[PDB]
Ligand binder design. Structure first.
Ligand SMILES: O=C(O)CN1CCN(CC(=O)O)CCN(CC(=O)O)[C@@H](Cc2ccc([N+](=O)[O-])cc2)CN(CC(=O)O)CC1
Ligand SMILES: [Cl-]
Ligand SMILES: [Gd+3]
Lengths: 211, 219
């Protein structure tokens, strides 16, 4: 069947006008393709933006408009807002089936800067009875969503046992992430100082632990 | 007002079937069409099929013989039934509502059913209470945790005090430590509330039907 192509990702600053395109591999996109646009927000939440006749659902901002520009479908956002950061999908009708495009991730720059809030948790007693020991380092309320996590055992850098999540959005549009340090019950008994160093925007904030 | 609630197990073994029910409210199936769309972790949206208001159907060509969508207007339910699933059918499945002109947009969508296609057997999580390192200062804030270790497949739901605590809660995404998932959750409450009163994390693994409560006690 037909492949519907969209730009992979676009980056704007607030107030800018952007045009996302939706192209058909079998020819020109026409009104008989009834181009729809859907918005995906963090935590896999989808909401309709534009309908088959360039109509907006009640409550969708007037800055979003759908159209046909030459041989392709388009979504114009007239004055990009911070809340418009999302993935945009178009869908084209082909007589007896719909086909979604690959999606356009829109990133909106210039949002308020915020440093991370770190919390280091010691392993549970109920965990040590299974002869396992995991240290949890929770990273909360940071913007931009880019962070490096470094672990230390008595000041000595750790090799294995560490696994870190890629940053995802919180309910307040800032980012969160977590980092683990899986160790053995005996290795936990030997060493005394444990440090979770979280580096964000060249700055480092750390939380230490001692049994 | 309008909602599409999804119920489907999740774990399917290769060559077997998938069945998902979409229960709608706030509108009637006699007026709206319901579409089925999926999203694979490494891809975007893939349209599968639809059941229109009149009971008429349409599907993506490659799915004609493996996918069926039918409904019961009186029960406000739409059923998705797909056979012969393979590894690349692993995705989040959604039902989406779409009306006739001027309501011809995919406005309201269901939250999605996470489907994992693997030979692997289910593994329930080991839930561990995470109490702070040092003791709290007189009149301050404390952050308690809950480690949900080694479960397969996704998802898992974490609540605190049966859903009564939400404002100071953060539930972190999972890591994949060699075919097993691990995530954490934390809650921040004042020191006058804990350890004076009971704070409990409630973890549920729907794909194993285990419901475990672990009370947070001082270290
Ligand atoms: O609707 C259903 O049950 C299923 N439709 C199947 C196909 N449609 C896709 C889908 O439904 O998936 C695409 C076309 N549809 C626009 C849209 O869906 O964007 C409408 C085009 C139209 C032609 C003539 C008149 N006229 O007045 O002569 C009015 C409208 C027609 N569909 C009613 C409606 O949607 O309004 C009726 C059929
Ligand atoms: Cl038609
Ligand atoms: Gd129609």
């Amino acid at each position: 069947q037909a492949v519907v192509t969209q730009e992979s990702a676009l980056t704007t600053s607030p107030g800018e006008t952007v045009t996302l395109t939706c192209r058909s591999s079998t020819g020109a996109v026409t009104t008989s393709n009834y181009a729809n646009w859907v918005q995906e927000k963090p935590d896999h939440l989808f909401t309709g933006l534009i309908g088959g006749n360039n109509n907006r659902p009640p409550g969708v901002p007037a800055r979003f408009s759908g159209s046909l520009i030459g041989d392709k479908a388009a979504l114009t956002i007239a004055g990009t807002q911070t809340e418009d950061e999302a993935i945009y999908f178009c869908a084209l009708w082909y007589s007896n089936h719909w086909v979604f495009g690959g999606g356009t991730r829109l990133t909106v720059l210039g949002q308020p800067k915020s440093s991370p809030s770190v919390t280091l948790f010691p392993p549970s007693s109920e965990e040590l009875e299974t002869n396992k020991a995991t240290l949890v380092c929770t990273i909360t309320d940071f913007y931009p969503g880019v962070v490096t996590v470094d672990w230390k055992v008595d000041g000595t850098p750790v090799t294995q046992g560490m696994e870190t999540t890629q940053p995802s959005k919180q309910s307040n549009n800032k980012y969160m992430a977590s980092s683990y340090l899986t160790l053995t019950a005996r290795a936990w008994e030997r060493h005394s100082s444990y440090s979770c160093q979280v580096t964000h925007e060249g700055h480092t904030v750390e939380k230490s632990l001692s049994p | 007002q309008v909602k599409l609630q999804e119920s489907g197990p999740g774990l399917v073994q290769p060559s077997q079937s998938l069945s998902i029910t979409c229960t709608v409210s706030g509108f009637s199936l006699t007026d709206y069409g319901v579409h089925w769309v999926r999203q694979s972790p490494g891809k975007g949206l893939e349209w599968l099929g639809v059941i229109w208001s009149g009971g008429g159907t349409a599907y993506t060509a490659a799915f004609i013989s493996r996918l069926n969508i039918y409904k019961d207007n009186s029960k406000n339910q739409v059923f998705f039934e797909m056979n012969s699933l393979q590894a690349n059918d692993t995705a989040m499945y959604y039902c989406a509502r779409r009306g006739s002109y001027p309501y011809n947009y995919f406005d309201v969508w269901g939250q999605g059913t996470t489907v994992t296609v693997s030979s692997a057997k289910t593994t329930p999580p080991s839930v561990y209470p995470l109490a702070p390192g040092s003791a709290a200062q007189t009149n301050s804030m404390v952050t308690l945790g809950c480690l949900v270790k080694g479960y397969f497949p996704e998802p898992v739901t974490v609540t605190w005090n049966s859903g009564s605590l939400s404002s100071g809660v953060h539930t972190f995404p999972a890591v994949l430590q060699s075919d097993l998932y691990t995530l954490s959750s934390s809650v921040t409450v004042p020191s006058s509330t804990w350890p004076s009163e009971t704070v409990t994390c409630n973890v549920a693994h729907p794909a194993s039907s285990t419901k475990v409560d672990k009370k947070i006690v001082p270290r």
